[PDB]
Design an enzyme around this catalytic site. Structure first.
Site, mmCIF file in Angstrom:
data_model
loop_
_atom_site.group_PDB
_atom_site.id
_atom_site.type_symbol
_atom_site.label_atom_id
_atom_site.label_comp_id
_atom_site.label_asym_id
_atom_site.label_seq_id
_atom_site.Cartn_x
_atom_site.Cartn_y
_atom_site.Cartn_z
ATOM 1 N N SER A 105 4.347 43.952 88.410
ATOM 2 C CA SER A 105 3.699 43.073 87.438
ATOM 3 C C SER A 105 3.241 43.883 86.192
ATOM 4 O O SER A 105 4.031 44.603 85.595
ATOM 5 C CB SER A 105 2.626 42.429 88.226
ATOM 6 O OG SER A 105 2.428 41.165 87.651
ATOM 7 N N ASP A 187 9.868 33.095 89.875
ATOM 8 C CA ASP A 187 8.510 33.606 89.714
ATOM 9 C C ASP A 187 7.528 32.556 89.221
ATOM 10 O O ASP A 187 7.699 32.008 88.142
ATOM 11 C CB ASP A 187 8.502 34.796 88.764
ATOM 12 C CG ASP A 187 7.248 35.648 88.910
ATOM 13 O OD1 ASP A 187 6.156 35.081 88.985
ATOM 14 O OD2 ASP A 187 7.342 36.887 88.964
ATOM 15 N N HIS A 224 6.676 35.983 93.008
ATOM 16 C CA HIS A 224 6.136 37.134 92.297
ATOM 17 C C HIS A 224 5.921 38.342 93.215
ATOM 18 O O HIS A 224 6.307 39.449 92.895
ATOM 19 C CB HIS A 224 4.836 36.748 91.591
ATOM 20 C CG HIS A 224 4.336 37.806 90.673
ATOM 21 N ND1 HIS A 224 5.066 38.261 89.596
ATOM 22 C CD2 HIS A 224 3.197 38.527 90.693
ATOM 23 C CE1 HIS A 224 4.388 39.214 88.988
ATOM 24 N NE2 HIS A 224 3.249 39.391 89.635
HETATM 25 P P1 MSW Z 1 0.961 40.500 87.489
HETATM 26 O O1 MSW Z 1 0.016 41.597 87.329
HETATM 27 C C1 MSW Z 1 1.364 39.579 85.936
HETATM 28 C C2 MSW Z 1 0.028 39.101 85.422
HETATM 29 C C3 MSW Z 1 0.233 37.793 84.619
HETATM 30 O O2 MSW Z 1 0.563 39.292 88.735
HETATM 31 C C4 MSW Z 1 -0.725 38.724 89.388
HETATM 32 C C5 MSW Z 1 -0.427 38.919 90.907
HETATM 33 N N1 MSW Z 1 -0.101 37.587 91.547
HETATM 34 C C6 MSW Z 1 -0.139 37.321 92.883
HETATM 35 O O3 MSW Z 1 -0.387 38.218 93.684
HETATM 36 O O4 MSW Z 1 0.068 36.046 93.346
HETATM 37 C C7 MSW Z 1 -1.109 35.202 93.131
HETATM 38 C C8 MSW Z 1 -1.322 37.299 89.062
HETATM 39 C C9 MSW Z 1 -1.211 36.588 87.811
HETATM 40 C C10 MSW Z 1 -1.739 35.285 87.529
HETATM 41 C C11 MSW Z 1 -2.464 34.591 88.511
HETATM 42 C C12 MSW Z 1 -2.632 35.226 89.756
HETATM 43 C C13 MSW Z 1 -2.096 36.528 90.007
#
Ligand code: MSW
Ligand SMILES: *[C@@H]1O[C@H](CO)[C@@H](O[C@@H]2O[C@H](CO)[C@@H](O[C@@H]3O[C@H](CO)[C@@H](O[C@@H]4O[C@H](CO)[C@@H](O)[C@H](O)[C@H]4NC(C)=O)[C@H](O)[C@H]3NC(C)=O)[C@H](O)[C@H]2NC(C)=O)[C@H](O)[C@H]1NC(C)=O
Length: 317
Positions: A105, A187, A224
């Protein structure tokens, strides 16, 4: 692409040091390290305990990671200070040898932001293996922005943010070291990712861009978090790390590997932990910091985003 001296760090060197940890070793003496950069809403171990800490260990690496506080929810430029510093130290600690970097991410965005504005690390990073990187951010962060419940880094990870702009104009959407981007069309957090092309948030010109669906078919679903933890992702990752060229190689994977379950080489309890990877991330966000505007760019990046709005107002040179 910016060149010359690194921008100075806003943070003390000791504080940075304190976000860096290696499994069974010290950064100043580590055999064959790999730096792991975690996703939004997580620490290094929350991101990687169930996956690439144990997998990279089996592949002959000493996993290290950063845990920017709080859970990668602060200013993305600060989270990068932790990464530049860690590479600096791990490159030294391993006998001035280049090292791989592997991310999830925001981790990818941090890696690439680092490479782009801190030229000293371009010759210390072997290669980059990013899972679901948001180099263009995500459009799905808008609601949270409209509600003012978005941490600093969520503002920056919003499509069209000052940060993602600044990155692009500085040359940052072209790979800088051999890079492999493994993402999913399905995603539910980063979008747009559907078009298997430069439109996608995870894409980098000249990168090895791999949309799982473009290899496994339109009904291949990984989320994701699956983007990081699946057997398919492993096989791609292993390719990338073992590759003589720094990039995963098509010769190394194919349809027999389209397994969206958790990586086979993980212990049953890691496979369970793996599937719950997203939990503490969603948690962190919900009770983490909140504001109603995007963090200011540092001086080193303001030249590349003139005309965007940060908390202090319009950016000018
Ligand atoms: P990344 O760091 C990209 C950020 C927009 O992703 C997190 C991790 N998601 C999960 O583990 O699933 C929930 C993210 C982004 C938005 C909302 C929750 C989590
Ligand atoms: C989360 O991110 C926010 C936003 O980035 C971040 O806030 C910024 O924090 C830094 C440091 O806390 C502040 O700015 C500069 O800090 C350096 C750091 O060392 C100071 O320089 C030191 O000064 C002392 C005393 O004069 C000196 O002894 C020492 O040599 C200097 N240290 C080093 C390493 O050089 C600067 O004084 C200071 N500069 C200015 C112009 O203020 C920022 O001001 C903060 N920005 C905002 C908007 O608040 C925060 O720290 C992050 N939090 C976490 C937990 O990661």
């Amino acid at each position: 692409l910016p060149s010359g001296s690194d921008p100075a760090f806003s943070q003390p060197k000791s504080v940075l040091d304190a976000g860096l940890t290696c499994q069974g070793a010290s950064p100043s003496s580590v055999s064959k390290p790999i730096l792991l950069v975690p996703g939004t809403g997580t620490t290094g171990p929350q991101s990687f305990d169930s996956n690439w800490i144990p997998l990279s260990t089996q592949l002959g690496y000493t996993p290290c990671w950063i845990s920017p506080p709080p859970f990668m929810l602060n200013d993305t430029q600060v989270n990068t200070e932790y990464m530049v510093n860690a590479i600096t130290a791990l490159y030294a600690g391993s006998g001035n040898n280049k090292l791989p970097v592997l991310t999830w991410s925001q981790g990818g965005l941090v890696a690439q932001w680092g490479l782009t504005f801190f030229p000293s690390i371009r010759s210390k990073v072997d290669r980059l293996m990013a899972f679901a990187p948001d180099y263009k951010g995500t459009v799905l962060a808008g609601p949270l922005d409209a509600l003012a419940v978005s941490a600093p880094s969520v503002w920056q990870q919003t499509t069209g943010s000052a940060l993602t702009t600044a990155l692009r104009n500085a040359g940052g959407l072209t790979q800088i070291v051999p890079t492999t981007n493994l993402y999913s069309a399905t995603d539910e957090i980063v979008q747009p990712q559907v078009s298997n092309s430069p439109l996608d948030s995870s894409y980098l010109f000249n990168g090895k861009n791999v949309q799982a669906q473009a290899v496994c078919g339109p009904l291949f679903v990984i989320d994701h978090a699956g983007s990081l933890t699946s057997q398919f992702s492993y096989v791609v990752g292993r390719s990338a790390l073992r590759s003589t060229t720094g990039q995963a190689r098509s010769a190394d994977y194919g349809i027999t590997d389209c397994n969206p379950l958790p990586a086979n080489d993980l212990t049953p309890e890691q496979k369970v932990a793996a599937a719950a990877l997203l939990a503490p991330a969603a948690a962190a966000i919900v009770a983490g910091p909140k504001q109603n505007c995007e963090p200011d760019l540092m001086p080193y990046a303001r030249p590349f985003a003139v005309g965007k709005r940060t908390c202090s107002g319009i950016v000018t040179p």
